[PDB]
Amino acid sequence: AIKFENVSYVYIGLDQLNFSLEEGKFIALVGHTGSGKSTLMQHFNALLKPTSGKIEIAGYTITPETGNKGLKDLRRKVSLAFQFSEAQLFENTVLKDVEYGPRNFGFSEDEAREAALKWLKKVGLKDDLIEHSPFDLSGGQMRRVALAGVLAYEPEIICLDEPAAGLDPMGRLEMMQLFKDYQAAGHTVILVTHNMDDVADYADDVLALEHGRLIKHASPKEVFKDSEWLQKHHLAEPRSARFAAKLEAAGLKLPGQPLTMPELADAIKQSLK
Amino acid sequence: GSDNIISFDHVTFTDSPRPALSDLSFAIERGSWTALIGHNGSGKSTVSKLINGLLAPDDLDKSSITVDGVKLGADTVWEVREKVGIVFQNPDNQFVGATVSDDVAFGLENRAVPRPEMLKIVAQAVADVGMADYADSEPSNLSGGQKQRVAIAGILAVKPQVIILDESTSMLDPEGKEQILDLVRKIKEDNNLTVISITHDLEEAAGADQVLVLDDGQLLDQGKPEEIFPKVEMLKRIGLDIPFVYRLKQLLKERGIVLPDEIDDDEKLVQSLWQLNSK
Amino acid sequence: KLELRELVLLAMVIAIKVILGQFKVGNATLQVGLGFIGSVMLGYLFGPWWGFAGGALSDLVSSVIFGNLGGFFIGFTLTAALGPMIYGFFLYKQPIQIWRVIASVICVTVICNIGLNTLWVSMMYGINFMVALSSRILKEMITPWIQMVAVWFILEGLSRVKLSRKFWS
Amino acid sequence: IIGRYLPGTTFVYRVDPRAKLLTTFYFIIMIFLANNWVSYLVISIFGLAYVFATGLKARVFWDGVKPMIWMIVFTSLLQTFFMAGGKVYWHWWIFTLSSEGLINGLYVFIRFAMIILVSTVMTVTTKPLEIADAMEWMLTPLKLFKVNVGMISLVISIALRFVPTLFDQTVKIMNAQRSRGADFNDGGLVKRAKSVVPMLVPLFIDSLEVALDLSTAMESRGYKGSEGRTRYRILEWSKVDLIPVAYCLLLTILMITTRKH
Incomplete structure (x- = not known):
């Protein structure tokens, strides 16, 4: 699991985070801008150490006096994909760029190549664009190459800061389904996002932050249960939730909680029958 | 015309x-x-x-x-x-000035607008967007929405037609996005x-x-x-995600609930389900 | 001769040089600053003359936002200008070669760090030239070889971007 | 580490940055003139009068001195052992500590102190944009060589506006590479030198993107060159700027008169 035991960070800041994310779920990390989502994300792989408290992630204890050695095996298991992760592309070819991570984490040149080729197939990159320069690709292709570079060494836990931002709707759907398949294969996906439709569609657990404190840790149905609480705590609903609220305001009784759009359509159909 | x-x-x-x-x-x-x-x-x-x-x-x-x-x-x-004044995509890659007031003033300095008139125009344009309390702020201390507001103010200060x-x-x-579109x-x-x-x-x-x-x-x-x-199939085949109301209408049509194509915003869909629930 | 796109790129490389001059590498015994990397990008991408201008302006910018640590003296501005000019004499519009990297780092070390920066220290602090040199000889007899190795790998990194679509020219 | 300015309300903060930067340069020039103990005493009283007239605490000056205090003492001891003369204390094979050596070491220590103290006042007591404006003002006599000074000022202003942005980008890039296994502080010489490409090449790619975007935005907003433009952010002289010229003319007279020639 990922246990945070009274975790704080100062100098954008965290204050007494207590949660236990279980292994194998799709966790959404929500909250307003500046609520400390990026700080918590960087705490997941000890880029930032806590000022007080313990982190139990991937069999590793992270403490305020945690050194900078032994983080290679932590970062081999816990991977972060930063926002605009295509910025980090630097290598001569696409394949060398993807296998930079595995070769960093002790993969052999044969193992890193096979891992890179598998994950370049998985992120949906064309086979001829392998051995091209990373700077000669399109924006979506560079995003896919960056996502393959952080998934090639098969991390146990992957933390994503807006991984499908600014993408084709089919490309956005394909990336979110890539992460859903990756979680369905036995891994933990943490999605730091401001979108709420993907939180409704894919997340099993939701971490809500507000000014650096954990304000809710529940399923998306329980997080989006009441609209007053989210508006008070600077959180948005999915559009299906807002439309269900507009239907209840009119007076249509909707069975279940319609967080997604097919669920909302099914609720409208059954509410008409 | x-x-x-x-x-x-x-x-x-x-x-x-x-x-x-x-x-x-x-x-x-x-x-x-x-x-x-x-x-x-x-x-x-x-x-x-x-x-x-x-x-x-x-x-x-x-x-x-x-x-x-x-x-x-x-x-x-x-x-x-x-x-024609263009507001581009990246908020801080079009932020040329050192502060908010210097960024709004940039297009006026290009036109050789005199400095007192420039001061009045910059103050009015910075107050036109919701950024009057940030006129002395560097771009590193601003969000993307605030920097987009400064971009709109700098475009607006020189009085464009487009x-x-x-x-x-x-x-x-x-x-x-909502704040920028409303502004x-x-x-x-x-x-x-x-x-x-x-x-x-x-x-x-x-x-x-x-x-x-x-x-x-x-x-x-x-x-x-x-x-x-x-017309949903055209926007589908050109890789465009249609708005919420239209794809909700498409899902309901796929579920047998046919709805007229003249519903364009969500409250119209709310009443269109109300009368169909009324009958 | 330099368009607005190249002017803004020169400002970016000046900013990069300032940021890299704030960076250090190596263990606690041996700290090597990274500003030579910005000197090499200034000379490699813009030539000797715009490299000279960029080095002088980078000294001014770094003095503005980090304080000019040595003092406030235009001799260090001249030295910071002269570095990228030598890198532009040796590396601008040239194929990447071992001898060019070695010769450029030697010429920058001898002309700027060993020779002229020692002259400014002896002029400012009133000491003899040999006293300033002995105060500075040990770092500048170790850092040239580290700089040669680093500059070598910088140049294929800068080359693979110049051959990419991102480089407009 | 970006911000070095510390706010205050003393008259030094009201001095024009052109006057303060000229006073800094002129103080370096007057430090060149100090050779005997009377001139070093005069330049020390003037520098300490400036420092006490800023009203700052001694800790900001100590932070200014801290990085090169070992360079200061090494240079001072090297001047102690080279220009030795007169008395002898603790004599060695070549190393000889002397009275003349100790006063020469004191002279070079005083010079290091007065250089750093006055330049720390320049950095701390005026805002970086104002220092940039003063430097643009001092590049004005380069117009005699037909050097495009407005182009230089534009390059300087863009570089200053984009140092904190590209520093955030550098830290972000390094964190993104470290997350997938990069070490920027281990490995030996070749491994360390290869490790700066994962930092520099994304930085140069980002700089190219920013340069294209910013030049596009500037040309969209009507920037056709530095000529024929007005200025929004001006520097204005005032009566407090007569204090630096009285401070510099009085220092000049005592420098010329008290030095041994």
Whole structure:
């Protein structure tokens, strides 16, 4: 699991985070801008150490006096994909760029190549664009190459800061389904996002932050249960939730909680029958 | 009548085999909000640079871009860039000044506006967007929505006739996109101007007066949002995610609940389900 | 001769040089600053003359936003200008070669760090030239070889971007 | 580490940055003139009068001195052992500590102190944008060589506006590479030198993107060159700027008169 035991960070800041994310779920990390989502994300792989408290992630204890050695095996298991992760592309070819991570984490040149080729197939990159320069690709292709570079060494836990931002709707759907398949294969996906439709569609657990404190840790149905609480705590609903609220305001009784759009359509159909 | 006129443009984008825009011909009506939607390779990324003259069309004899009666040539680009102001995509990559007031003043310094008039105009434009309390703030201390507000203020300070929002909200959080669109709407009907949106956000295009649809450099289809978004298969096959109301109507139609195509916004769908629940 | 796009790129490389001059590498015994990397980008991408201008302006910018640590003296501005000019004499519009990297780092070390920066220290602090040199000889007899190795790998990194679509020229 | 300015309300903060930067340069020039103990005493009283007239605490000056205090003492001891003369204390094979050596070491220590103290006042007591404006003002006599000074000022202003942005980008890039296994502080010489490409190449790619975007935005907003433009942010002289010229003319007279020639 990922246990945070009274975790704080100062100098954008965290204050007494207590949660236990279980292994194998799709966790959404929500909250307003500046609520400390990026700080918590960087705490997941000890880029930032806590000022007080313990982190139990991937069999590793992270403490305020945690050194900078032994983080290679932590970062081999816990991977972060930063926002605009295509910025980090630097290598001569696409394949060398993807296998930079595995070769960093002790993969052999044969193992890193096979891992890179598998994950370049998985992120949906064309086979001829392998051995091209990373700077000669399109924006979506560079995003896919960056996502393959952080998934090639098969991390146990992957933390994503807006991984499908600014993408084709089919490309956005394909990336979110890539992460859903990756979680369905036995891994933990943490999605730091401001979108709420993907939180409704894919997340099993939701971490809500507000000014650096954990304000809710529940399923998306329980997080989006009441609209007053989210508006008070600077959180948005999915559009299906807002439309269900507009239907209840009119007076249509909707069975279940319609967080997604097919669920909302099914609720409208059954509410008409 | 029409403010911007494009007739038969081609841009081959400096080695590229295929032209990004191919025989493109549209007109932008004066005083309207027109949205250009399309895929990331539809050619709409070059339209704003073509309108203000930063890019030239492939053949000047057979192409014609007229802005407010002023044809674009190599010489009239500065007459056009005082009519057209573009808000670009990245908020801090268009933030040229050291502070908010210095960034808004940049376009006025280019026009050699005298400094006291410049001070009054900059203060008024900074107060026009919601940024009067941040006039001395460096861009490193601003959010993307605030820097987009400063970009809109700097464009607005020099009194243009057209604002072009070229993917302006595409790097913002959802709470910033709403604020920027509301601000641009307030600015538009407070300054009697035309807004052109190049966007992949189709909730922005749903509020437009006109929607131009681009597909591989061709003007695919044209019209109001209430007659662009009901045709769902075309926007599906050109890789465009239709707004919430229209894909909800599509899901309900796939579930047997047929709804008229003249429902354009969500409350209309609320009543359209109310009377169908009433019967 | 330099368009607005190249002017803004020169400002970016000046900013990069300032940021890299704030960076250090190596263990606690051996700290090597990274500003020579910005000197090499200034000389490699813009030539000797715009490299000279960029080095002088980078000294001014770094003095503005980090304080000019040595003092406030235009001799250090001249030295910071002269570095990228030598890198532009040796590396601008040239194929990447071992001898060019070695010779450029030697010429920058001898002309700027060993020779002229020692002259400014002896002029400012009133000491003899040999006293300033002995105060500075040990770092500048170790850092040239580290700089040669680093500059070598910088140049294929800068080359693979110049051959990419991102480089407009 | 970006911000070095510490706010205050003393008259030094009201002095024009052109006057303060000229006073800094002139104080370096007057430090060149100090050779005997009377001139070093005069330049020390003037520098300490400036420092006490800023009203700052001694800790900001100590932070200014801290990085090169070992360079200061090494240079001071090297001047102690080279220009030795007169008395002898603790004599060695070549090393000889002397009275003349100790006063020469004191002289070079005083010079290091007065250089650093006055330049720390320049950095701390005026805002970086104002220092940039003063430098643009001092590059004005380069117009005699037909050097485009407005172009230089534009390059300087863009570089200053984009140092914190590209520093955030550098830290972000390094964190993104470290997350997938990069070490920027281990490995030996070749491994360390290869490790700066994962930092520099994304930085140069980002700089190219920013340069294209910013030049596009500037040309969209009507920037056709530095000529024919007005200025929004001006520097204005005032009566408090007569204090630096009285401070510099009085220092000049005592420098010329009290030095041994």
